[PDB]
DNA sequence: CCGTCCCCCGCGTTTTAACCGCCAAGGGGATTACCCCCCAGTCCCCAGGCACGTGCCAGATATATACATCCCGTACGCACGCACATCATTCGAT
DNA sequence: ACCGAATGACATGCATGCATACAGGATGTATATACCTGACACGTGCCTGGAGACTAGGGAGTAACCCCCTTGGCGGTTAAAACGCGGGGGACAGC
C-alpha cells in the first residue's frame, strides 16, 4: 500500500524528530502540511538548476558536484562533497 | 473649544502623505556632520566628496525603513499596535545580523 | 513600457524615478530580479496593514 | 530516493541518479529545515506561546524575504 | 488576571515496509583519436557617438477656489432597569 | 378558608443607557488658475573604434570503446510506522 505521492512518504514522526533537533517543544497538528509544501517548494528550485547543469553537459545522469553548485547559488554552500 | 483629532487620527494621515512622497527626511546638515565625526576614527582629515554624502543618506533611510516595516509585522503577530525594542532585536536576529 | 504607461496614467509625460519604482515593485516577475537593489528617491509603495485601520 | 525521482521526472525524463549525489539533498534540506525550524520558536516565544503554528512559519519565511 | 477546554502528549498495540543481503544487465559515463573550422590577431577606416551649445518649450512652478471628509454634537429611538402602584399572596381575625 | 391588613408578585411608570443616524462644521484635499525656465531636446562637431578583410592554429566536435555502477529484482526480520486513547495544560478569550 505504497503507491501514491511520495511526499506523504515523509512520515509525521520524522518531522517530529526534526523539530526536536531544532529545539521545538510542542507542535500543533497543522504544521505537518505546510512543512510538506514548504519542503516541496525547496526541492523545486534546487533540482531545476541541478537538472540544468546536467543537461547542459549533455549528461543523462545527475552527479554529486551538480548538487553543490546549485546549492552554492542559493547562498547555501555545502562543504564535504567536492570542490 | 478648538477641534481636536482623535488619537492616531492624525498619524495615519502622514502615512498616506509620506509614502506618496519620495524625498529625504533626515535634516541635511547634521547627517553630513555625523558621518565626518565617525569617519574621523578610521582616518584623519579625510575630505568627503560632496555628492558622496547624500548617497549614504539615501541608503540609510532605505535600510532604515525596511527595518521598521519588518518590525511592524511581528508586533501585529504579537497582537500589539506599538513597537518596542524587543521587536527590532527579533527582526535583526531573524535576518541574521545581530546574531 | 510599464513606467512610461504608469506615469502617463498619472497624467505626467516625463519619466521620473518615483514612476520607475512603482513598475518594478508592482510586477512580481521583475520583483524577483530587483528584490535586492533599491533605487535612489524610489519611495515606498503605498501600503497600510489592515489591522492598523480605524476600529470602525 | 523515490521522492527525488518522482519530482525530477517532471523537469525531465530518464534521469539516472548517481548514488553519491543522493544523500546531499537530505543534508542540504535537513539543515535548511532545521534552520527554518529554530527561528520559528523565537517567533513563537515572542507571542508568549510555546507551541508553533503555521502562521508563524509563514511569518518567519517572510522576514528572511523568501516568502515573497 | 482568570478561565476555559481541547488537542497534543505519552503510552500500548501491531503492520509493514524499510532494510538487509544477494544476484544481474547494461546503459552510459568515462576515456582516446581526428580534425576542421572558428575565433583571435592585424590593418585600415569612417561614421556613431560623444562633447558642447543652445534655447525653447512645455514641463514644471507657483497662485485661488471647490470639494471631500471626520468628528462631535445632536437628537432620537429604544429597550432597558429601577421604581412604582397594583395585583395577588399571606398572617391574623373570623 | 374567607375576610382584612399586610406584603410579595405582577404590571407598568419612570428614568436611563445605549445605540444610531444626522447635520454641522471644520479641515484637509482636490480642483483650477496663471506664469516660469531650469532643463530636455536637439544640433554640430569630431574622432576613434567598430567593422572588413586577411591569415593561423588549436579547441570543440565528432566516433569509438569500455565496464561499473545503476538499475533491477528478491526474499527475511523487525524496527519503525500506524493506531487508540486519557488526559491535562496550553491557547485563548475577557476585564
Curated annotation (Swiss-Prot), chain A:
There is a cross-link at residue 72 (Glycyl lysine isopeptide (Lys-Gly) (interchain with G-Cter in ubiquitin)). The modification N6-glutaryllysine is found at residues 12, 40, 58, 60, 72. The modification N6-methyllysine is found at residue 1. The modification N6-acetyllysine is found at residues 12, 40, 60, 72. One of its GO terms (biological process) is nucleosome assembly. The modification N6-lactoyllysine is found at residues 12, 58, 72. GO terms for molecular function: DNA binding; protein heterodimerization activity; structural constituent of chromatin. The modification Phosphotyrosine is found at residues 32, 69. The modification N6-succinyllysine is found at residues 12, 58, 72. The modification N6-(2-hydroxyisobutyryl)lysine is found at residues 12, 25, 40, 58, 60, 72. The keyword Nucleus applies. The modification N6,N6-dimethyllysine is found at residue 1. There is a cross-link at residue 12 (Glycyl lysine isopeptide (Lys-Gly) (interchain with G-Cter in UFM1)). It is found in: Nucleus; Chromosome. The modification N6-butyryllysine is found at residues 12, 25, 58, 60, 72. Keywords: Acetylation, Chromosome, Citrullination, DNA-binding, Hydroxylation, Isopeptide bond, Methylation, Nucleosome core, Nucleus, Phosphoprotein, Ubl conjugation. Its main location: nucleus. The modification N6-methylated lysine is found at residue 1. It comes from the Eukaryota. Demethylation is performed by JMJD6. Monomethylated, dimethylated or trimethylated at Lys-1 (H4K20me1, H4K20me2, H4K20me3). Monomethylation is performed by KMT5A/SET8. Trimethylation is performed by KMT5B and KMT5C and induces gene silencing. The keyword Phosphoprotein applies. The modification N6-propionyllysine is found at residues 12, 25, 58, 60, 72. The nucleosome is a histone octamer containing two molecules each of H2A, H2B, H3 and H4 assembled in one H3-H4 heterotetramer and two H2A-H2B heterodimers. The octamer wraps approximately 147 bp of DNA. This is Histone H4. It comes from Xenopus laevis (African clawed frog).
Curated annotation (Swiss-Prot), chain B:
The modification Phosphotyrosine is found at residue 5. The modification N6-methyllysine is found at residues 1, 20, 28, 43, 86. The modification N6-acetyllysine is found at residues 20, 43, 79, 86. The modification N6,N6,N6-trimethyllysine is found at residues 20, 43. The modification N6-(2-hydroxyisobutyryl)lysine is found at residues 20, 28, 43, 86. One of its GO terms (molecular function) is protein heterodimerization activity. It is found in: Nucleus; Chromosome. The modification N6-crotonyllysine is found at residue 20. The nucleosome is a histone octamer containing two molecules each of H2A, H2B, H3 and H4 assembled in one H3-H4 heterotetramer and two H2A-H2B heterodimers. The octamer wraps approximately 147 bp of DNA. This is Histone H3.2.
From Swiss-Prot, chain C:
There is a cross-link at residue 56 (Glycyl lysine isopeptide (Lys-Gly) (interchain with G-Cter in ubiquitin)). Core component of nucleosome. Nucleosomes wrap and compact DNA into chromatin, limiting DNA accessibility to the cellular machineries which require DNA as a template. Histones thereby play a central role in transcription regulation, DNA repair, DNA replication and chromosomal stability. DNA accessibility is regulated via a complex set of post-translational modifications of histones, also called histone code, and nucleosome remodeling. The nucleosome is a histone octamer containing two molecules each of H2A, H2B, H3 and H4 assembled in one H3-H4 heterotetramer and two H2A-H2B heterodimers. The octamer wraps approximately 147 bp of DNA. The modification N5-methylglutamine is found at residue 41. Belongs to the histone H2A family. The modification N6-(2-hydroxyisobutyryl)lysine is found at residues 11-12, 32, 55. It comes from the Eukaryota. This is Histone H2A type 1. Following DNA double-strand breaks (DSBs), it is ubiquitinated through 'Lys-63' linkage of ubiquitin moieties, leading to the recruitment of repair proteins to sites of DNA damage. H2AK119Ub and ionizing radiation-induced 'Lys-63'-linked ubiquitination are distinct events. The modification N6-succinyllysine is found at residue 32. It is found in: Nucleus; Chromosome. The modification N6-glutaryllysine is found at residues 32, 55.
Amino acid at each position: 500500500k505504497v503507491l501514491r505521492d511520495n511526499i506523504q512518504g515523509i512520515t509525521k514522526p520524522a518531522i517530529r524528530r526534526l523539530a526536536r533537533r531544532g529545539g521545538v517543544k510542542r507542535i500543533s497538528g497543522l504544521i505537518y502540511e505546510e512543512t510538506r509544501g514548504v519542503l516541496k517548494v525547496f526541492l523545486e528550485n534546487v533540482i531545476r538548476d541541478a537538472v540544468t547543469y546536467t543537461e547542459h553537459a549533455k549528461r543523462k545522469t545527475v552527479t554529486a558536484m551538480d548538487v553543490v553548485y546549485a546549492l552554492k547559488r542559493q547562498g547555501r554552500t555545502l562543504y564535504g562533497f567536492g570542490g | 473649544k478648538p477641534h481636536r483629532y482623535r488619537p492616531g487620527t492624525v498619524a495615519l494621515r502622514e502615512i498616506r502623505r509620506y509614502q506618496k512622497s519620495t524625498e529625504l527626511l533626515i535634516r541635511k546638515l547634521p547627517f553630513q556632520r555625523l558621518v565626518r565625526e565617525i569617519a574621523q576614527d578610521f582616518k584623519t582629515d579625510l575630505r568627503f566628496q560632496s555628492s558622496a554624502v547624500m548617497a549614504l543618506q539615501e541608503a540609510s533611510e532605505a535600510y532604515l525603513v525596511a527595518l521598521f516595516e519588518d518590525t511592524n509585522l511581528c508586533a501585529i503577530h504579537a497582537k500589539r499596535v506599538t513597537i518596542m525594542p524587543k521587536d527590532i532585536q527579533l527582526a535583526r536576529r531573524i535576518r541574521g545580523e545581530r546574531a | 513600457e510599464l513606467a512610461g504607461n504608469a506615469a502617463r496614467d498619472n497624467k505626467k509625460t516625463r519619466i521620473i524615478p518615483r514612476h520607475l519604482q512603482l513598475a518594478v515593485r508592482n510586477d512580481e516577475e521583475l520583483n524577483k530580479l530587483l528584490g535586492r537593489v533599491t533605487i535612489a528617491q524610489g519611495g515606498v509603495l503605498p501600503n497600510i496593514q489592515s489591522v492598523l485601520l480605524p476600529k470602525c
